[PDB]
């Protein structure tokens, strides 16, 4: 892993990454030279577009959709799906099918 | 499929030390039935052949049943004398019996001459030469060259029975992707070529009588005495072409007009005869109406 | 059957396997824990620490939003490899699963042990809460290929019969010695519809999913096919009237029929043949 | 159908060859006339060979084709091998 | 991300202008074989951020014989379409006075939707297909036969040939791939054209269901 | 009397293992006690199916209505040794499932709810529980009173050997060995016949004894054996 993300972060260093494909936090990488500008012009005006596109873009009593709009409400109703279930024990029990292949020489 | 298991406790027998993976220790018999067998072979051979017998002993259920089912499913199929097939309910089937409507018990296989040779070995064989007196000398008597070095009409009808021959070798090559010969066909062509030559004493070693347009043309009337799909409207034609498309490209290319003057030196007499005979041949192979050909095929 | 120079050298034929075989979490994972840290800027753990406050000292993503409660990782070399694949990619998908809510980062790909942290930033508790989160992610998080499709082989057929065979610019035929994909599952659907997957020769044994793939006269020749390979398989031979009368039968009314009382005893043969064969009281 | 045109196969099936000497020597059997020169068979089948090998049998064959016509030939009209 | 769509873009494009010229349309060799790199050229190579984007991709073709027969063929956006779309494409074809048209949906078809096309059946025909089961052209494997099409001059023909009637024949569904890729309904007859290894060529009828 | 872990591939528990008990003297028939582990929170949850109880119980309940009530006196008794930890968290699921029942009176109303009849008074209940875990379940450990501390080794012996199976420190029973097999001779065999035949004779001077005690007359043994039972029943 050699090139660098190596984008101008606020802080004004730029980023020493190590990521094969893409930064975490500056999109895809592409290649940047020692002072962070892409090699490529049309790469740096890519970057430069999508920074600008990012860039552009009973009160008083308690509301019940409070707690169904939340995270945790979410993330409970994805995973206590019965579906989600079903493959969650579907895995396992393949899983048991390997610890069952585990007497190879023997009668079982 | 397996050597023999670990019935004890990771031992194939309590007289072998435990984890023993060696030949002996799993059942690997190293006397022939004359020298005798050691005890533990003895029971190693004893439960070998316990799988056999309980194999024996326990396909015949199941296949017994799939014969019934298919029995059922099939029997009432049958060959109508329109000789299409069809079902009790009288819907079509097949519109001729196994796509070329011959009986079963009359084919049998042969190998198409075209379909592998390659392009230069095919133009060497199967082309008729006509330019060369020196061969058509040797092989052709002296009255046969005279015309046929001459005319011009039978240039262009051996030309012509090279151009068809050329065509069936694309539609071969289509046909048959992978280059395989073996088909199964009705009549024997080279046995009845080698019988014609033993019935007429046919000697390899003097010029022939046979004039190739009578080989040419011959061949023709033949290939129009082979009627499988009956009529004359452009349909029962068309059908009559497909339903022994295969057959006619195999006649066609072994009973040539090359061949048959380098290979088989028949006679007018013997191609005569050869013709009758393909033609009775072919004619008894067909499927005759009110063959139940259900169960037949279950 | 491969289409390009995939067909010819090996890692093409590899790279397209591992772009079909299914690879969910579980494959790719060394061992897991639910530790408790309040402070990312101090992890329990040691080892971590360096690539820790690599990432939390830059603020793209709240720390106050962060529970304590963190799950870790620990994703093994070689797994991580053999399906030449990177710690960007499986950053990608468990954003692209849960969205957001799941804060996901991870070091880079140089350290001996390979290991990246889902620790949760927004009935059950938390404890219970990523217990569950971590079985759902190892069970059904897919990061690459199709679904019922468990492992692939790859092989050049020594027997003619699945090699490449061509008509070369002499007419002859010559079979070439190529690379090919046995699997273990079917997606035929999906499976067609690839870089290089040939579509004009990849075909499979199971002949209802062709079926409706590929209609009536697809299956009609792969019905065909199957049966002339268990027959012939031992060297033995039948005619080809028989198969074929077997087969059109079969398939005479448009769907599969099944040789069966549910298929062969459900069509117009007409009330007393119908109760010869089987399940006479209902028949009559 | 059209007595002019006749679809059918010219041969005599082995079906057809089966029941027409069957019957043939079930009415031999019967004491009916025989149509050509016995030299010293007695039994009915041997005798219904030596007509249908002489194409004396009078028997005509009625072919029903799946549309629901039919074809009547005589046993003589048709091609006999076996 | 987006070169694979692209590519899919095209692929389809591809496939259904195949699919035109088989049905009978005309269609300029250009776009039977059109590469991908043109296609780039011609729509832009980043459809993910929206050049080209998908309603840029209609087609509208012309039959061989008859000028006035003409099909679309729209490439709706929202992968679950809802009726409302449906009842826009409608009313888009309706003024622009055509009759028939196809839907090439991404993700699926609500079941309304689906149940507008069925009632609606006898004022215009219009199918639906999905993405996936385009990106393959079927008619070129090699288990799936030649077919054809049949005129009814050609079926009264067979019919008084074989003097067999139309239920005698065997069929097939019409809701098999290939009937709905060839776009023939109930009443027509498809003939088959495979390659027999004991008689050469063999050719079979089927009615449709 | 011993112990076998077995699978079935095509299941809804990965294990069980059951005992088909049976005091050695031919008292009673062998009643059988499985105690499985069910497939795949999702964690592994151990159940027994005791004999005479309308429904699976989780066993920690099965301890707890023994008297060894406090979890850790009752993984004393399963777990032989406290270090290894994988079976530690293999039993923590089981021993999470019945937090809510703490007390032996609460578990034997647990257990004794399902059983004979519902609508029965509490003390019916709880002694029909205690007579069950008593005299039903593992009789050949014993069928007298305070066998309660021999139940609950062996009970934890049973669990013991599921718990090896499913972390695999041991092998599944095979069926087919010969040593988990006693073949039957005519003792035995004649032995079942004459004990089901003389408790149908004694079912039948009972009926006799009745009728004429309920007239208010004596009887007579000669008349009350009808003799032929055994005889026409053995013949
Ligand atoms: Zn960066
Ligand atoms: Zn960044």
Not at chain 5, 37 to 65: C, I, M, Y
Request: glycine share 6%.
């Amino acid at each position: 892993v050699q090139h660098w993300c190596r984008a101008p972060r606020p802080d004004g260093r730029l980023c020493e990454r190590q990521d094969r494909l893409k930064c975490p936090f500056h999109g895809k990488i592409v290649p940047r030279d020692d002072e962070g500008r892409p090699l490529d012009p049309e790469d740096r005006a890519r970057e430069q577009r999508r920074q600008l596109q990012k860039q552009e873009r009973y009160p008083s009593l308690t509301n019940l959709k409070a707690q169904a709009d939340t995270a945790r409400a979410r993330i409970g109703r994805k995973v206590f799906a019965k579906a989600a279930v079903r493959r969650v024990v579907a895995a396992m029990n393949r899983m048991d099918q390997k610890k069952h292949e585990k007497f190879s020489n023997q009668f079982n | 499929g397996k050597r023999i298991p670990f019935g004890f406790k990771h031992r194939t027998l309590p007289h072998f030390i435990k984890d023993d993976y060696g030949p002996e220790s799993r059942g690997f018999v190293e006397n022939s039935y004359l020298a005798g067998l050691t005890p533990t072979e003895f029971f190693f051979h004893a439960m070998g052949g316990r799988e056999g017998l309980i194999d024996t002993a326990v396909k015949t259920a199941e296949t017994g049943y799939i014969q019934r089912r298919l029995i059922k499913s099939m029997e009432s199929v049958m060959v109508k004398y329109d000789a299409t097939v069809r079902n009790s309910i009288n819907q079509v089937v097949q519109l001729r019996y196994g796509e070329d409507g011959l009986a079963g018990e009359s084919v049998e296989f042969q190998n198409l001459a075209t379909l592998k040779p390659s392009n230069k070995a095919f133009e060497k064989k199967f082309r008729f030469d006509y330019t060369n007196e020196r061969a058509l000398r040797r092989t052709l008597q002296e009255d046969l060259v005279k015309d046929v070095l001459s005319n011009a009409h039978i240039q262009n009808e051996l030309e012509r029975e090279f151009e068809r021959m050329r065509e069936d070798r694309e539609v071969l090559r289509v046909i048959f992707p992978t280059g395989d010969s073996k088909v199964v066909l009705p009549c024997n062509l080279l046995r009845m070529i080698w019988n014609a030559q033993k019935i007429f004493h046919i000697n390899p070693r003097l010029p022939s009588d046979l004039h190739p347009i009578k080989v040419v043309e011959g061949v023709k009337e033949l290939s129009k005495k082979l009627v499988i799909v009956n009529g004359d409207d452009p349909l029962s034609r068309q059908a009559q072409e497909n339903a022994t498309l295969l057959f006619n490209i195999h006649l066609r290319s072994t009973l040539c007009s090359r061949r048959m003057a380098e290979e088989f030196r028949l006679s007018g007499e013997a191609f005569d005869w050869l013709l009758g005979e393909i033609e009775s041949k072919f004619n008894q192979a067909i499927a005759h109406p009110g063959e139940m050909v259900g169960a037949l095929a279950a | 059957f491969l289409l390009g120079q995939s067909a010819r050298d090996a890692e093409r034929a590899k790279d397209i396997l591992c772009r079909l075989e299914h690879t969910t979490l579980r494959k790719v994972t060394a061992n897991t824990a639910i530790y408790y840290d309040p402070n990312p800027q101090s992890t329990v753990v040691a080892e971590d620490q360096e690539w820790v406050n690599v990432y939390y000292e830059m603020p793209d993503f709240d720390v106050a939003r962060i529970s304590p409660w963190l799950l870790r990782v620990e994703l093994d070399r070689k797994h991580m490899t053999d399906r030449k694949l990177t710690m960007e990619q499986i950053a990608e998908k468990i954003n692209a699963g849960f969205g957001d809510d799941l804060n996901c980062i991870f070091n880079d790909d140089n350290a001996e042990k390979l290991v990246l942290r889902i620790r949760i930033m927004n009935k059950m508790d938390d404890d219970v809460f990523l217990r569950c989160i971590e079985s759902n992610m190892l069970t059904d998080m897919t990061l690459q290929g199709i679904e019922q499709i468990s492992k692939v082989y790859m092989h050049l057929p020594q027997t003619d019969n699945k090699k490449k065979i061509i008509i070369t610019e002499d007419g002859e035929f010559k079979a070439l010695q190529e690379w090919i994909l046995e699997t273990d599952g079917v997606s035929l659907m999906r499976v067609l519809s690839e870089k290089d997957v040939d579509p004009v020769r990849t075909t499979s044994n199971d002949i209802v999913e062709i079926f409706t793939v590929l209609g009536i006269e697809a299956v009609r020749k792969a019905l065909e096919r199957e049966l002339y390979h268990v027959i012939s398989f031992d060297g033995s031979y039948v005619n080809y009237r028989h198969l074929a009368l077997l087969c059109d039968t079969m398939t005479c009314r448009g769907h599969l029929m099944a040789i069966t009382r549910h298929g062969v005893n459900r069509q117009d043969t007409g009330p007393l043949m119908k109760c010869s064969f089987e399940e006479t009281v209902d028949v009559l | 159908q059209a007595n002019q045109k006749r679809i059918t196969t010219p041969y005599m099936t082995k079906y057809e060859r089966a029941r027409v000497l069957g019957t043939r020597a079930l009415q031999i059997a019967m004491c009916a006339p025989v149509m050509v020169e016995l030299e010293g068979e007695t039994d009915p089948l041997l005798i219904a060979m030596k007509e249908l090998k002489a194409r004396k049998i009078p028997i005509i064959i009625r072919r029903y084709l799946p549309d629901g016509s039919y074809e009547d030939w005589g046993v003589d009209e048709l091609i006999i091998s076996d | 991300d987006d070169e694979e769509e692209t590519y899919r873009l095209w692929k389809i494009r591809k496939t259904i202008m195949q699919l035109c010229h088989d049905r009978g349309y005309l269609v300029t060799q250009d776009e039977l074989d059109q590469t991908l790199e043109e296609f780039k050229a011609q729509f832009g190579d980043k459809p993910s951020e929206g050049r080209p984007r998908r309603t840029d991709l209609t087609v509208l073709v012309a039959h061989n014989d008859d000028p006035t027969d003409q099909m679309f063929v729209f490439f709706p956006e929202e992968p679950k379409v809802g009726i409302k779309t449906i009842k826009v494409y409608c009313q888009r074809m309706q003024e622009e006075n055509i009759t028939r048209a196809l839907i090439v949906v991404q993700q699926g078809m609500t079941p309304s939707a689906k149940q507008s096309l069925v009632d609606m059946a006898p004022k215009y025909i219009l199918e639906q297909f999905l993405q996936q089961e385009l990106l393959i052209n079927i008619t070129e494997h090699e288990l799936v036969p030649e077919h054809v099409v049949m005129t009814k001059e050609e079926v009264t023909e067979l019919l008084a040939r074989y003097k067999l009637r139309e239920n005698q024949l065997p069929r097939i569904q019409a809701g098999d791939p290939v009937a709905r890729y060839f776009g023939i309904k109930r009443g027509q007859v498809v003939k088959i054209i495979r390659p027999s290894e004991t008689a050469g060529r063999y050719i079979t009828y089927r009615l449709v269901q | 009397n011993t112990v076998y872990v077995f699978a079935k591939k095509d299941s809804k528990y990965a294990y069980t293992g059951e005992c088909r008990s049976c005091l050695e003297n031919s008292s009673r028939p062998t009643s059988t006690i499985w105690v499985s582990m069910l497939a795949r929170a999702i964690g592994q949850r151990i159940v027994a199916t005791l004999p005479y109880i309308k429904q699976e119980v989780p066993i920690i309940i099965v301890f707890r209505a023994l008297g060894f009530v406090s979890d850790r006196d009752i993984l004393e008794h399963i777990i032989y040794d406290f270090e290894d930890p994988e079976m530690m968290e293999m039993v923590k699921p089981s021993l999470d499932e019945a937090f809510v029942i703490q007390e032996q009176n609460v578990a034997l109303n647990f257990i004794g709810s399902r059983g004979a009849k519902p609508g029965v008074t509490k003390e019916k209940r709880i002694k029909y529980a205690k007579e069950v875990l008593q005299k039903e379940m593992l009789p050949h450990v014993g069928v007298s009173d305070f066998c309660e501390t021999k139940k609950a080794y062996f009970l934890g012996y049973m669990v013991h050997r599921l718990l090896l199976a499913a972390l695999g420190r041991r092998e599944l029973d095979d069926r087919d060995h010969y040593g988990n097999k006693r073949l039957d001779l005519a003792g035995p065999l004649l032995a079942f016949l004459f004990r089901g035949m003389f408790k149908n004779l004694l079912k039948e001077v009972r009926i006799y004894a009745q009728k004429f005690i309920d007239r208010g007359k004596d009887f007579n043994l000669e008349l009350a054996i009808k003799t032929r039972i055994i005889s026409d029943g053995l013949k």
